């Protein structure tokens, strides 16, 4: 019913923000994205959560790359959520970062097999 990210509990805010500062200066054409499975999803967790994403990639391109990391069957649907809404397909990841990044300078995206996050 609302986004929950285990990553934020595991890493206290001040540590996250320091890392976000550094990674934005080191890789300025990339956006740092934390990717987690939504609770209740029947998908399986990524082996790694921390992705650097060229700002020019479209959201749709990002969808496909995450799908390949889950080794997800083509017939299994996959939806993404940022701040409780499904992002626009035409946006670039740089544009999504501009609108939705948090105060640690990361962008948080959840995925699920369901079109409703809390389901």
């Amino acid at each position: 019913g609302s986004m929950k990210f285990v990553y934020k509990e595991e890493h206290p805010f001040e540590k996250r923000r320091s890392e976000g500062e550094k990674i934005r200066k080191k890789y300025p054409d990339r956006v740092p994205v934390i990717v987690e499975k939504a609770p209740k999803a029947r998908i399986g967790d990524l082996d790694k959560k921390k992705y650097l994403v060229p700002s020019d990639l479209t959201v749709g391109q990002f969808y496909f790359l995450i799908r390949k990391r889950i080794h997800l069957r083509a017939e299994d649907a996959l939806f993404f959520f940022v701040n409780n809404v499904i992002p626009p397909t035409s946006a670039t990841m740089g544009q999504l970062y501009q609108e939705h990044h948090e105060e640690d300078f990361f962008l948080y995206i959840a995925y699920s097999d369901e079109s409703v996050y809390g389901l």
Partner: peptide, 13 residues
């Protein structure tokens, strides 16, 4: 890449 980050297109750590 650095700090455990994965470059998403190439898979470079």
């Amino acid at each position: 890449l650095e700090d455990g980050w994965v470059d998403i297109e190439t898979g470079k750590e």
